[PDB]
Design a protein around this ligand. Structure first.
Ligand SMILES: CC(=O)SCCNC(=O)CCNC(=O)[C@H](O)C(C)(C)COP(=O)(O)OP(=O)(O)OC[C@H]1O[C@@H](n2cnc3c(N)ncnc32)[C@H](O)[C@@H]1OP(=O)(O)O
Ligand SMILES: CC(=O)SCCNC(=O)CCNC(=O)[C@H](O)C(C)(C)COP(=O)(O)OP(=O)(O)OC[C@H]1O[C@@H](n2cnc3c(N)ncnc32)[C@H](O)[C@@H]1OP(=O)(O)O
Ligand SMILES: CC(=O)SCCNC(=O)CCNC(=O)[C@H](O)C(C)(C)COP(=O)(O)OP(=O)(O)OC[C@H]1O[C@@H](n2cnc3c(N)ncnc32)[C@H](O)[C@@H]1OP(=O)(O)O
Ligand SMILES: *C(=O)CCCC[C@@H]1SC[C@@H]2NC(=O)N[C@@H]21
Ligand SMILES: *C(=O)CCCC[C@@H]1SC[C@@H]2NC(=O)N[C@@H]21
Ligand SMILES: *C(=O)CCCC[C@@H]1SC[C@@H]2NC(=O)N[C@@H]21
Lengths: 541, 210, 541, 541
């Protein structure tokens, strides 16, 4: 029927209060700084390497992505801040690679482009990490991969951190062999010079495109056969497009230049015989009833000052409609049912510390969502897990483990958004990075550590006073200042959003307006795989 | 004689093309199962950055590059040579004709939009302008060796002969068929390497020219 | 019938040749050094911490493991060298944890013991890595986990490297929630003091044992509630055995002391209703026809000097019987069918560089083994992948990708043993660490890098001469000496066996005699899971 | 998106060249002769038997088929040339039976009509063969069978060739019992006189229609009970419609005359509760850009003179669009992706002899098509398999077996069209009759033998010279002429299209224009069954 009226969330804030104005100014400053940093990352390796890249007749890699995807279609780029201030004097913009979810020939694909302007397409350790994260996104969501290979091989003085381990360079080819065994298409466009580790990327792909007189594939290049076997060969007749396309048979399609390679790639994606079938129910999409710079006014940048998570849900969901679940029992967790772009979402949001009743409310909700096949969105703003004595007497760590066990075992698409702090085992109760969410974005005011600093400094000091009390002497003000300096400094440095996305601990720092769009994009990509039945472990009652 | 298009007219041609591509996107979506979904809106919304599309339109004989920035509010900022235009608009239908509704720097206009193969037609009350879309090379592009180990049937040429391209040079029968060697080359046959009746071998030279 | 006679491998070596005597002396020196290093690792944190550990009435952790497993039963300990010279001035023996496959109540289990004598049971990053490796062994092979928890929580100074990422501390609880959802039993014996990250280990387990007046479980300890909430509590009444066993209900069994906890654990394992069922064919086991110190004489320590891998197969398989497969085509790869302790094994061994025919022979063999459900043993001794021009003309990187794709897609138990070098993409063709083998042991003479040293120095020098030739000047002898020093030094340092097992890049450095026993142990553990049908990708013909 | 432009195949031929004019005249002569032969086959047993058939008030069988199928709907008739000059002085038009795929009540069905004007509906051996082929088409494609039974029992002096074997008359009832066990509906309309082997056809069917005073079912007729038991009975009260419809219960519906039987049959098909569901992707159909009498000009009738298969693909596919796969490697095989009537087709066409690279290209393509569930169309024009010495040194018979093994194991709908010669094991590499294609049509210029006449005569002569050389004498010109006469004559006689479709070695000789329509009809019928996952054997690399 769906004609009967309901109520909506959200209230209009006081635009003149000094709290709102200060919060708006702080979050506007954070978002402007985020914008200028990513505009510097957008250039890549500087204008010298871009000039020498277009002097050989190639496109720049973002031009390749713009010409590959559908015209006017959005592009969800993942981990734009990988490698940011990570290596000591080396600048690696974007990680040295560009991964994203786009729309090619009406199919949502994962696109992995070697940005060859930075270090000649060398593979730093964060490059391997960011590429492996893109590949596990594409295997989880069942998205075809398009690799735009312009590589340079594995860096040498970091070779340990690139070569042998489980989640090191060789995993890449493992992920190609397994995805193609599940009918997840791999397409490689060779636009560069694949030297001996990159050379396995087109040879492990179902269909190749290589560019005339520009793309080269060899298991051992000219200086490599020089140092290994002692031989001089020219590169374009050692591994050029003519040899591979006509004699050896490594390549399947042959392109004149980069525009022809991208046109052929769109043809290849169209001949994949793929049709997206949905299993959730869809309703007409509707925009909310409130703007999204109000989120700048509401959230701010002060993590010691709490707010209400219902204001955020009011500004990201369809029509600001929200069916709340158990609204009075355990009210530091907000659970409910909403819709984003017509998709049904179960939302779990933090509003305080986690008590025992909040964790039981969350476990009941996650079982409900897995029984009905409804995707989950976690909105992390955590400070702790209620330390105390009357709390451990009840079973608080008996109740947060049920929350952890239900979030781990859940087989629906889960997406996390960290809108505030995220500390301790609370981070595990609300689907942190270890619990395999499909995506995990953060806002520019977030913090994530094992504690908050003050607490770590206090625990270390009291633990070392206890420890030294086998003999026992104090250095009171000296120990205080000399432990409260380098621990607060370290925890505030490593809790930053740029510190955590300089590694690949999340999928991006996003602007609080763009939030709604980004969730919709992620949720539609996450619906390419059919939702499987959930089996839970043993709930410890 | 034909007159050059104004930069505002190139903005209208670029906008009509972009909106036509959107129309194709919309009619694909209407046939999709995944309806109402994002990606269907041709908004060009990149994450944290803007998207600029570089297209080239051919005005008569000369090419003009137009850099189209997709704005968050649905407008376009089109920079043609150096000058930036604020370009907004949409399509609407009246009967069986499609019209392009434009607003360029606050100046509203209306023209009929017809796109036939490569040519963009804009019919207005001040004239008619034809802008062409360039065609990329890969859509407009369309000595000898013995193929199999077979016996030679007939040799057509001698040492010292002058032939043309697409001319019968040697014939060989291989197993079940008949494959004539013909010349792509130009020049003079100095050498008939195989006598008549001999057995040539795959990927081998039959005739050499100096 | 099985009565008809066959032939066997192996020849008796010249015990008097100087090659044999020098090789025997070198490999004996390596094995004696391995023995004395692991005997120093066996003590743990020194005799001071052991005295203070037994002054509180606890056992040492190796005593706990000896009293838990069946009497006289062998114990396969994994990664005894984790953390060896890994942190700069901190000594972390054994990683700070003891993992192994043992036999408890007639069931082969995985045992994970917190060695509390080192750093009070603190979790270093290699401790998290080694524990996660043990847990993925137990999930792959379907082995019950017994955690002997005596923790100390995260580490703090290196909290970033322990906390947020995907394969960081929180993954531990993920692996408990998923294994218990597959009916793989978790048992936790709380013998120590689980502080706020360790406190989730018994609460995520199906059955607990906690020790009277010794084991404590709390989500926030006394200095932690001091720094977080500001409260003084006593520890044994904040989280002691009486509160959890009688009021909160976190614990299920209650033990008087450590011997009672281990006796109760053997009871709990016996009530698991588990019966091991085999699906392979078994024959009577038989010892080989040659000794195993001959392997010291044959292998040696010189990696520039090649040997025959059939001498090794002659000394590890049943009766030295070996049915060779394609013995004359691609003879730098030795493939065949043997038996170890009555189990059928398909063996793939390196004897030289990998040509194209060797890779095709290996792909045919791996398809044969997956069709028949026969486990695989890879014996890596690699130097390369045949760099050349007439080799890339054929499709060498078209043929090694088939080997990689078949080894990746294979769903039988695979075990790797690195008996020599292992360089380059050859490492991926022969089931390196990235290709999920069940186990991966190394011999003390092995080397593993992205390529030998010399080659990396030569490639870097020739590419920087090419690079600088845009302007172009030479520093010939200076550049030569100053690049041939710190690159050969780095590659020989990082290629060591102790460097690679100081991380968790393998499951152990083993003595070449013990090889046969260790393979048998690993293979029987790997047969606890039923072998699934293999689906391959697209073979690029 | 699907808006971006692509290129198309085909070039317009020289309408004035003498090659085109001669080819057009030859293929026009072949097609006119095919038309006049099938118009003579259309009459059946002559005008005497047709007059005596309509004197009893029955329709002719093609009238029955026209009144049964949907009005204006096309009819795909199978094997119109069965029995053509097959028996020595007996003329059996059409085989004595009419099989075809039609459209009844909006459902595509298989219709099997006993043409009772020829030999009173007797079952010759080619009648049993043609009927069994129709039934295996209906079991493969999951089409309901409608039998219009007007039989006469199994011929007597050919009784061996009709009775006992596996694929002899009794298989018919086997195929009814198995199809009806898979929910493939059987409907029998008894319009004739089913005598003791035909009497099992309505009794094995789910629903019957029998005609008042015209249809009779008995296990032993009046002369049969005369010769067996010695009894005189009248036929219409031994087995007429009244006894079976009212007392014995063999019949379910009762018809007044043939029009009532066909109207009731359309009702019965409408109550089948069948709904056709597609699993491939469909696009808007589009006609090609070239005519189809150009195929007369291009192909001709000279099999020694080669042509290009891309000219044929240009004239049968949607819009003449074709995405070629590996166009430069192994260019005597043309593989690619096209569309016929909106269905995705992978096309494999011959352009020369089969080398090793062509067979590897084909194996890669067939794996690609089975991974994506794309139907296959093989266009056979074969002369051989590249006999030679440097070819057997590589492994040519190692590479054609991969092509054979991939075509055999493939579980997508395969359709073959023989547009030229088809000789040797090349016939098996390109999905001959033994490899279970759904359909197999031929053009009137085709040839199929084990080799090519000349080759067989030469091999027999040289092997008998070798054979007699144990003593050794020659009969040179005598042996030459006397072996080159009766071997070229035999091979050219048995290689004819009418020789091969006089048996049921194919599904029809078709006109090269009608080709496109026929493929579309066959492909839509072949989509009534859901495509199953393909398992391959062991690829011998
Ligand atoms: C052997 C291995 O598998 S590991 C490394 C791969 N093997 C190699 O061939 C290493 C040598 N480099 C190459 O692979 C190739 O020759 C390429 C890609 C570097 C050639 O790239 P070009 O387009 O000629 O640019 P160039 O070679 O100048 O490289 C640019 C810069 O990146 C560096 N670089 C490029 N590839 C690598 C690499 N694989 N390892 C280390 N540094 C590299 C170069 O030192 C150079 O230095 P600079 O940035 O300080 O000027
Ligand atoms: C950090 C978290 O997320 S939870 C942990 C927070 N709180 C704590 O664990 C502090 C107190 N807890 C302890 O470690 C306790 O000492 C126990 C009970 C677990 C271990 O038994 P104790 O008898 O206390 O051992 P003790 O504390 O003397 O251990 C001494 C060493 O352990 C180290 N240590 C123990 N736990 C930790 C930890 N979580 N982080 C860093 N270091 C630690 C200390 O640095 C100390 O160093 P030292 O070798 O210079 O003395
Ligand atoms: C035993 C078995 O396996 S099947 C044998 C069945 N036994 C019989 O003899 C039944 C045959 N009798 C009949 O029912 C009728 O012949 C019918 C209905 C089949 C044919 O219709 P009618 O209008 O009677 O035509 P009729 O049978 O008189 O003659 C038609 C021709 O078919 C032939 N014919 C019919 N059945 C058979 C048969 N089973 N074997 C050989 N010839 C046959 C007749 O000899 C006659 O041959 P002709 O062309 O030389 O004249
Ligand atoms: C900052 O996050 C405040 C202190 C952290 C709370 C501590 S850390 C470990 C314990 N686990 C938990 O959920 N809370 C406790
Ligand atoms: C030491 O291992 C010798 C040189 C390494 C061989 C090189 S490294 C990268 C290429 N891949 C491969 O398999 N061999 C080549
Ligand atoms: C006519 O078809 C020419 C000769 C046939 C080729 C022969 S016949 C048997 C061998 N198999 C094959 O594929 N080619 C060889």
């Amino acid at each position: 029927y769906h004609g009967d009226s309901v109520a909506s969330l959200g209230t209009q804030p006081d635009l003149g209060s000094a709290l709102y104005q200060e919060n708006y100014k702080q979050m506007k400053a954070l978002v402007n700084q985020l914008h200028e940093r990513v505009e510097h990352i957008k250039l890549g390796g500087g204008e010298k390497a871009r000039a020498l890249h277009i002097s050989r007749g190639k496109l720049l890699p973002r031009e390749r992505i713009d010409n590959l995807i559908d015209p006017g279609s959005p592009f969800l780029e993942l981990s734009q801040f990988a490698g940011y201030q990570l290596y000591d004097n080396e600048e690696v913009p974007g990680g040295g690679i560009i991964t994203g979810i786009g729309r090619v020939s009406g199919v949502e694909c994962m696109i992995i482009a070697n940005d060859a302007t930075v270090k000649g397409g060398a593979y730093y350790p964060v490059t391997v990490k960011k590429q492996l994260r893109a590949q596990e996104i594409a295997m989880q969501n069942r998205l075809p991969c398009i690799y735009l290979v312009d590589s340079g091989g594995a860096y040498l003085p970091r070779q340990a951190d690139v070569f042998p381990d489980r989640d090191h360079f060789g995993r890449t080819f493992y992920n190609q062999a397994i995805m193609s065994s599940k009918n997840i298409a791999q397409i490689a466009v060779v636009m560069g010079s694949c030297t001996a580790g990159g050379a396995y990327v087109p040879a492990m792909a179902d269909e190749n495109i290589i560019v005339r007189k520009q793309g080269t594939i060899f298991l051992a290049g000219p200086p490599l056969v020089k140092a290994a076997t002692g031989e001089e060969v020219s590169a374009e007749d050692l591994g050029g497009a003519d040899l591979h396309c006509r004699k050896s048979g490594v390549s399947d399609h042959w392109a004149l230049d980069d525009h022809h390679a991208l046109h052929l790639t769109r043809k290849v994606v169209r001949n994949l015989n793929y049709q997206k079938k949905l299993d959730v129910t869809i309703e007409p999409s509707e925009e909310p009833l409130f703007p999204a710079d109000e989120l700048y006014g509401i959230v701010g940048a002060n993590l010691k000052r709490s707010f209400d998570v219902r204001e955020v849900i009011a500004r990201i969901v369809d029509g600001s409609r929200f069916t709340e679940f158990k609204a009075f029992y355990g009210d530091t967790l907000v659970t409910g049912f909403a819709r984003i772009f017509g998709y049904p979402v179960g939302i779990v949001g933090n509003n305080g510390v986690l008590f025992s009743e909040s964790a039981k409310k969350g476990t009941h909700f996650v079982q409900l969502c897995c029984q009905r096949n409804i995707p989950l969105l976690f909105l992390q703003n955590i400070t702790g897990f209620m330390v105390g004595r009357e709390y451990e007497a009840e079973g608080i760590a008996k109740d947060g483990a049920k929350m952890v066990a239900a979030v781990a075992c859940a087989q629906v698409p889960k997406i996390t958004l960290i809108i505030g702090g995220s500390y301790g085992a609370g981070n595990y109760g609300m689907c942190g990075r270890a619990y395999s969410p499909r995506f995990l974005y953060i806002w520019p005011n977030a913090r994530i550590s094992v504690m908050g600093g003050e607490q770590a400094a206090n625990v270390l000091a009291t633990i070392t006073k206890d420890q030294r009390a086998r003999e026992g002497k104090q250095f009171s003000s000296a120990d205080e200042a000399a432990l409260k300096e380098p621990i607060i400094k370290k925890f505030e440095e490593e809790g930053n959003p740029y510190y955590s996305s300089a590694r690949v601990w999340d999928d991006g720092i996003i602007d609080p307006a763009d939030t709604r769009l980004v969730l919709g994009l992620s949720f539609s990509a996450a619906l390419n795989a059919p939702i499987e039945k959930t089996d839970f472990g043993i709930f410890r009652m | 004689s034909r007159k050059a298009a104004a930069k505002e007219s190139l903005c209208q041609a670029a906008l009509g093309l972009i909106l036509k591509e959107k129309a194709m996107t919309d009619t694909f979506t209407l046939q999709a199962h995944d309806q109402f979904s994002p990606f269907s809106s041709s908004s060009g919304r990149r994450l944290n950055i803007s998207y600029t599309r570089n297209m080239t339109l051919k005005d008569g004989k000369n090419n003009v590059a137009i850099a189209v920035t997709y704005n968050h509010d649905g407008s376009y900022s089109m920079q043609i040579e150096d000058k930036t235009f604020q370009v907004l608009g949409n399509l609407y239908s009246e009967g069986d004709c499609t019209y392009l509704k434009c607003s360029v720097n606050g100046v509203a206009s209306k023209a009929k939009l017809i796109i036939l193969e490569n040519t963009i037609y804009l019919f207005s009350k001040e004239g008619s302008i034809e802008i062409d879309i360039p065609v990329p090379k890969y859509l407009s592009s369309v000595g000898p060796l013995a193929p199999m180990t077979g016996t030679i049937e007939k040799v057509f040429v001698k040492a010292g002969d002058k032939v043309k391209a697409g001319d019968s040079l040697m014939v060989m029968i291989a197993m079940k068929m008949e494959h004539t060697i013909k010349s792509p080359k130009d020049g003079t046959v100095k050498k008939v390497f195989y006598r008549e009746g001999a057995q040539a071998n795959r990927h081998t030279p039959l005739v050499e020219f100096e």
